[PDB]
Amino acid sequence: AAQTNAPWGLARISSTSPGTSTYYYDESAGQGSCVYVIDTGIEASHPEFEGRAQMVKTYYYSSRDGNGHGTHCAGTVGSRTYGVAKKTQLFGVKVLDDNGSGQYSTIIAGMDFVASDKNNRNCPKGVVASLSLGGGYSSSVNSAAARLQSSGVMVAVAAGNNNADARNYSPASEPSVCTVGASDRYDRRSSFSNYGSVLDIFGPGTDILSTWIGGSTRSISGTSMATPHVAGLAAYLMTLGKTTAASACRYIADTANKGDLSNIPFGTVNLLAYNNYQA
Ligand SMILES: [Eu+2]
Ligand SMILES: [Eu+2]
């Protein structure tokens, strides 16, 4: 399948070079997989989700996304026009308030929730969790992310936006999950992206168009935007049978575009997520 005039990040993940505008992908499109988006919520009524999104848990007064951040990330995973895995099922867990903030105890509870809730869901091709959030180092937050991965869920987390070594941020610094940095449309590391030995992979993160609340769309930047590209790619690859939740991060790294990025400090991987699609 081919999507013409696609957002640049979708085109980039299906090409060996920058500057293309068509997203090439297999028609299976992540069907049979499930992605939990652990964030500010998802506006599940947005037409771009086609009935494939639902809220399953909130830690606040309402399950509504009053911010937009979670709806944008969910759109990059699996919306029709803006998503990597256009037929996946999306589940929202609201651990962040409508200002985009949340306490570590609530974030931990949301990860433990997903590890249990997945046993109630029909996800024959596998389960992914996308965490576009983080803060200062906490061993308890890292441990919760490690538990979620060990339970059989592919965990993708943002590296952080501090232009610093990700070893001082959580859950980015947990080795056992998939820690995602950001790149721009010219194959440079995004100017805000964290780096360091704990990063596993880069994805598109500067000027990413996706869904927004009120049935709208908007372009924003961050490692929060790169993370759902990798989460959606994992769901897509699991549906094709190429990898499993336990090994998806390693498979993505082994099959990535290598050496294409500039402004990568010594000691950080030079790997950009790539779907290896061949018609
Ligand atoms: Eu190349
Ligand atoms: Eu890792």
Q: How far is the CA of 222 from the centre of ligand 1 (A)?
A: 23
CATH of 1-279, one of 3.40.50.200, 3.40.190.10, 3.30.160.270, 3.40.1190.20: 3.40.50.200
d(CA 39, CA 107): 9
Tell me the torsion sign for CA atoms 220, 84, 69, 226.
Answer: negative
Ligand nearest to the CA of 258: 1
- Residues making up the annotated binding site are 16, 175, 177, 200, 260
Ligand nearest to the CA of 199: 2
- Please provide the size of the chain in residues: 279
Q: Closest Cα partner for 274 from 7, 23, 78?
A: 23
Residues, CB within 5 angstroms of ligand 1 (ion): 16, 260
Q: Is 224 a known active-site residue?
A: yes
- Which among 15, 33, 173, 224 is annotated as catalytic? 224
What are the DSSP calls for the chain, one per residue? Answer: -EETT--HHHHHHT-SSSS---EE--TTTTTTEEEEEEES---TT-GGGTT-EEEEEESSS--S-SSSHHHHHHHHHH-TTT-SSTT-EEEEEE-S-TTS---HHHHHHHHHHHHHHGGGS--TTEEEEEE---EE--HHHHHHHHHHHHTT-EEEEE--SSSSBGGGEETTT-TTSEEEEEE-TTSBBPTT--BSTT--EEEE-SSEEEEETTTEEEEE-SHHHHHHHHHHHHHHHHHTTS--TTTHHHHHHHTSEES--BSPPTTS--EE-------
Q: How far is the CA of 3 from the centre of ligand 2 (A)?
A: 31
Ligand nearest to the CA of 171: 2
Q: How far is the CA of 238 from the centre of ligand 1 (A)?
A: 24
d(CA 251, CA 242): 8
Q: Are 253 and 269 in contact (CB under 8 A)?
A: yes
- Which among 46, 69, 72, 229 is annotated as catalytic? 69
d(CA 246, CA 238): 11
Q: How far is the CA of 223 from the centre of ligand 1 (A)?
A: 22
Q: How far is the CA of 257 from the centre of ligand 1 (A)?
A: 6
- Domain ranges in the chain are 1-279
Q: How far is the CA of 34 from the centre of ligand 2 (A)?
A: 21
What are the DSSP calls for 121-136, one per residue? Answer: S--TTEEEEEE---EE
- Which among 39, 65, 165, 184 is annotated as catalytic? 39
Ligand nearest to the CA of 187: 1
Solving technique: X-ray
Q: Is 207 a known active-site residue?
A: no
